[PDB]
Ligand binder design. Sequence first.
Ligand SMILES: [Zn+2]
Ligand SMILES: [Zn+2]
Lengths: 478, 478
Amino acid sequence: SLLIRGATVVTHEESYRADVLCANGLIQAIGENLETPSGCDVLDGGGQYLMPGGIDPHTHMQLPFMGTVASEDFFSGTAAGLAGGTTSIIDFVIPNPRQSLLEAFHTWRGWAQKSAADYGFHVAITWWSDEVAREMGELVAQHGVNSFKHFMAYKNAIMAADDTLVASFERCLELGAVPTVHAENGELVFHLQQKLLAQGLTGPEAHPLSRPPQVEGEAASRAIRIAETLGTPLYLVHISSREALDEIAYARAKGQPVYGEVLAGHLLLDDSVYRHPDWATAAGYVMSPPFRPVEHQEALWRGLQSGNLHTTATDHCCFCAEQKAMGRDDFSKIPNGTAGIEDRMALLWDAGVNSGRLSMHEFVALTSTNTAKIFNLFPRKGAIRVGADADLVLWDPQGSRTLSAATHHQRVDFNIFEGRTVRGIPSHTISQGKLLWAAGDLRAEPGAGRYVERPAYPSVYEVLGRRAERQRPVAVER
Amino acid sequence: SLLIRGATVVTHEESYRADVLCANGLIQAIGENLETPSGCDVLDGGGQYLMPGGIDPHTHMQLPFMGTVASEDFFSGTAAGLAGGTTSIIDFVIPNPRQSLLEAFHTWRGWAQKSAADYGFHVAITWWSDEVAREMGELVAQHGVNSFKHFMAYKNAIMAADDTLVASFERCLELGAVPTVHAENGELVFHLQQKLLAQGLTGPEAHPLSRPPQVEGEAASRAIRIAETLGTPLYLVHISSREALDEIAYARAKGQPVYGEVLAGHLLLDDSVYRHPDWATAAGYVMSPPFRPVEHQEALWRGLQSGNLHTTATDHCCFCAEQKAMGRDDFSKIPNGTAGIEDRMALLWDAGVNSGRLSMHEFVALTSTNTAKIFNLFPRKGAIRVGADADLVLWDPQGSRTLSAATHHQRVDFNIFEGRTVRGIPSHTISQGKLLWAAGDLRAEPGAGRYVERPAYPSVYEVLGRRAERQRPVAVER
Ligand SMILES: [Zn+2]
Ligand SMILES: [Zn+2]
């Protein structure tokens, strides 16, 4: 067992000085001057903050994608997360078109077995048929999935057009599952890619131009209004644009349950990174949605402060130089993705909390609690309370770290924040009650993490249910 | 020739006392105490306002549509417009899918030959191919068309999906033509129609429920952002919802050239009309988009006052009780459309000018001049100046009229403003310099109107051209 002693507990709401005891994977007791079981290990947290471990709901460990397989696997990725204070992930099962969802799910379960920390899956709806809708039913009832991902881009691949989105959202409603969406207009992306290639703009600087912010705002508006019509909630993954954020805020003002996810990269980087003279450097930043002109970073910070963006994630999707260089002659063939699972919490703490833009409680809400609530994992996760999973991070407000591809634990040769020094770092990370990161030493073990099931019908479905009752149509009698 | 003496001339900007002389179809002279050519007729405009005749850019005379043919034909419709102060129309050629655009154009020219006043056409893009793209160019270069209509609704009929919108908008840009859009999401409409019928809601009260406002807002957002991406202007036909209006306003706030059209019905009627106990009365109001909850009418008036709505029109699409009753068992089979060409200007003057919501100059801009500008007909139309077409209305601010299906000149048995009394009416209407409406007497003759060609490249394409030059992608040198 493990007792964290002398730290200030910081939750999504409040701060209070307390000791915390963990045993048997759970938080057992919280209070001052706690009694110590015999042989219990002790961690001294004086002058530090003790928070829930981060939850990263958007990772792509060893994703086979755009020709090849991501260089980060489920072990090295979850391990790198632990070093950065992240104690659990939600990844994506991505069936090929025409491929059984259950078959892809079991393949992905095997891959994730080596995870060093708790993990779960969204399942992507990459094609539609009657059997897909049935396989969605087994995934929810039997395999602990409660959210389904829809890609609005990738025309001629996995793009879900309006009819699939409509049919799939209706299925999500019947199952009490959360629809999630990668919001970019796939038709516009395809058109711009071919226009830019025909002009000879083959380099990475054409990648931001091939999917400008209104392509994201359009798809956000469309998924949001399909979700309103069908009566489902909606989770929009990694929002990057003022356009998309303004569509989310518009829907939330109308009482619609719409959630926005954001990456640290889109809070802190602008699209000038794509104009770097060195091809490999520019290609290192290639991901979808791309990094944006500076106006959009300020807008995203406003969404965080106003409560119109709710969760942080990383889109952790690692490709090394040789893999990126598959698109050396054609930016549209660069495998999309950047690393970030190890860096998310420190980047957000340094930019948000140190500056006073965000409270420590907002930081906790944005790194674990809101994700936990949205996907029906609260208070098992994202919570410091008796009976909750003992996933915790000890945070040193005066500690320093310099992000570098040469020193990070992410199995990739590039860092989009290379050279950045942050103040405020995770000194210790606790997962399932065990100390797996301690001041420079990572103790992750392959296979230690558990598969985390997420129950259906998060509490928003209670609100939606009564709304549908109140709005039943009544015929006119004539 | 015809001399209007003693009136106050009211334009889109100013008012001043002047006589106006017309001859040979044109305005020949404007001034105080004009001399009278020999044999010139004289019309006394004392105590009245002399304005450009209304332009109605949205009519559907004798449309074959939803099973049958509209009861108003090009003569009775243009004549009814004259009695109501409207001196020219723009109608729609609507080819069947896979039907030659040129073939449909010539058929519609034959039909429109009987017009009593000037008329022109938008051409609808009801299917796509290389031949459609070729015929669009011939229509612009040889037949005086400069605008192409796209229906985003009517799934499995004439719906233009994203790939058609993209390709057609690209063609409009190449030709200097204005894309226009009927903005409703066809997939959502189809889903809601079939859901409501399976619930047994077959009556007209299900029609608004089958296309609620976010269905229009989504489609507006999508056409607008396709237009931004492709670099074209965009005209959205009859906007009815705050949602769509807010998307227009959002884009215009960023400097995008987006124009909105509105009908008097959507300014003044709410959706309670569809719950009328008499089936035929409820069905009389069935049109798309449908009339909306009251909050939406106030939003549209503000869009007019703020300059985010630009034109008024009527969607003049007449079906009598028998024709409406084709959907007696199935609201989705009710031929959609209402009458308004005769009523538009008095409805707007009485509701807008008498109340102080709109100046007389805004009334002129909203009833002719903005339409003329957008479609490259200014100052030929919508203008009181030497050399402009002599299309004029003499307006009596103290004249009264009560709108009724029993007394109107529109060849249809229903008026959506039945019983409404308005103050401020056209006492005389002048088309091509001849008096065709004179204090109760209609003197319209079939064939008197001319086909009005509209030149390509309205001046907005000049700014767009410089904008695209300045924002051209530039390659990074490596
Ligand atoms: Zn992703
Ligand atoms: Zn229409």
